[PDB]
Design a protein around this ligand. Sequence first.
Ligand code: HEM
Ligand code: HEM
Ligand SMILES: *[C@@H]1O[C@H](CO)[C@@H](O[C@@H]2O[C@H](CO)[C@@H](O[C@@H]3O[C@H](CO)[C@@H](O)[C@H](O)[C@@H]3O)[C@H](O)[C@H]2NC(C)=O)[C@H](O)[C@H]1NC(C)=O
Ligand SMILES: *[C@@H]1O[C@H](CO)[C@@H](O[C@@H]2O[C@H](CO)[C@@H](O[C@@H]3O[C@H](CO)[C@@H](O)[C@H](O)[C@@H]3O)[C@H](O)[C@H]2NC(C)=O)[C@H](O)[C@H]1NC(C)=O
Lengths: 186, 186
Amino acid sequence: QSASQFTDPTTGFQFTGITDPVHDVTYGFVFPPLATSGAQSTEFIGEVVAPIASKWIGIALGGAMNNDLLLVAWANGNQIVSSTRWATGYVQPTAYTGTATLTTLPETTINSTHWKWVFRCQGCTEWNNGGGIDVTSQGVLAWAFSNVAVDDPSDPQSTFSEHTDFGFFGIDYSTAHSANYQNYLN
Amino acid sequence: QSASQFTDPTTGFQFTGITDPVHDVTYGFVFPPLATSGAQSTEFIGEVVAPIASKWIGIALGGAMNNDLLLVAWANGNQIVSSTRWATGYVQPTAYTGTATLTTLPETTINSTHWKWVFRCQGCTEWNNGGGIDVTSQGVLAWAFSNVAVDDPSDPQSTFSEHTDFGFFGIDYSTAHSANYQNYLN
Ligand code: HEM
Ligand code: HEM
Ligand SMILES: *[C@@H]1O[C@H](CO)[C@@H](O[C@@H]2O[C@H](CO)[C@@H](O[C@@H]3O[C@H](CO)[C@@H](O)[C@H](O)[C@@H]3O)[C@H](O)[C@H]2NC(C)=O)[C@H](O)[C@H]1NC(C)=O
Ligand SMILES: *[C@@H]1O[C@H](CO)[C@@H](O[C@@H]2O[C@H](CO)[C@@H](O[C@@H]3O[C@H](CO)[C@@H](O)[C@H](O)[C@@H]3O)[C@H](O)[C@H]2NC(C)=O)[C@H](O)[C@H]1NC(C)=O
């Protein structure tokens, strides 16, 4: 599939991403302004808008399950529980051992039909194995879905069962930067 | 997703299509030679190679659920049960009333791990609603998957439950024609 630009209706944030039509989960990404005189920033802002029947959602930042930074999130009552994870060999991903900071932003909402997770991800484009994303070029992102809740929803590091669906989308990161990035943070 | 050319290792048939990595179902299509003078053929040969956990598979020949010819098939023991369907709305598709003939070809195989449906679809590029596929250009196909059995597997017109997954892929029909099509029919 292929990402495209869209605007968040409520917040007005401008993102690049997709809506998966099967589970109707929207995934959006926006990046700080492209640099030419400095190395690119290692952070970005993302959003996941998911029907409440989505019991956990994962994002694979390099487009594959193994050896890339994973984000995993679920709603637990009125809050989002989230974590950075990593997998080798197609088993339960565990806590990421590098430096990566997930901040839930206040645009985040949980209501009766959907959870909307808006987050800042610092240190997420470059990983502690030397891998990472090139935000000036074209890449692939992947997502994972489950409609079965995690084993222990109040634990960010909870274990859980394999996803019931997963998918990919191509993204042109060079078009995903915003001059308004700093304001999304305030 | 995007289709690509591939050869069936067993049969040697050359197809254009994809493998869905989630359910590991392969969809392949091949068309008779393009005509130099006159109308194109309205038939094609297809194959679905599915793990036996695949309880029913659908193909939407115009890429959407409604207003296009649908093919539905499932394994019933050592036989493939299949039918042409049509959907008015997002509800149980019913028997297609147009001129479309599905023939199971002798290369069809059911073993302990997979069912491989090889079929001829006559009159399947043009439908009785006036629409159809343009075999000289580029289009979109879609597939539907269920891991739950149909209500009566021996009835080709069986009712069944909504798919548990569905997906799309682009296909360049202009490169999906084969000089060996006649040989596939023999
Ligand atoms: C206990 C939980 C997990 C298990 C046992 C598991 C297992 C698997 C297996 C067996 C596959 C291969 C499926 C196929 O190709 O037929 C797979 C693929 C994949 N998984 Fe997971 N998974 C789990 C959690 C996750 C999470 C949390 C994410 C994302 C944050 C993830 C993302 C993916 C992706 C994107 C793929 C497809 C690409 C690839 O093959 O690398 N998985 N997973
Ligand atoms: C009782 C059986 C069926 C029911 C109730 C049903 C229901 C639905 C629903 C509610 C959607 C919209 C899903 C979404 O966008 O969230 C849909 C999508 C779709 N269905 Fe079905 N469906 C059934 C059978 C089939 C079959 C037999 C096929 C193909 C042979 C098919 C092909 C598709 C496709 C390709 C889509 C996505 C594109 C579109 O929205 O038209 N469906 N179906
Ligand atoms: C619960 O949260 C969900 C997710 O944020 C909310 O759904 C969304 O509501 C907004 C505003 O009503 C919808 O926005 C717009 O779409 C309509 C339809 O085309 C358009 O006419 C408007 O101009 C605007 O662009 C949005 O599409 C919808 N998003 C989702 C994924 O459904 C919902 O508002 C919240 N419900 C409650 C309990 O407050
Ligand atoms: C049931 O039928 C399926 C489908 O025909 C069988 O799977 C297929 O088996 C063939 C081997 O005859 C595989 O081709 C092989 O692929 C490898 C590369 O991975 C290549 O090195 C070989 O030369 C050959 O081309 C084919 O990939 C495989 N297809 C799938 C979807 O798995 C299956 O083995 C049969 N099961 C039984 C129990 O007989």
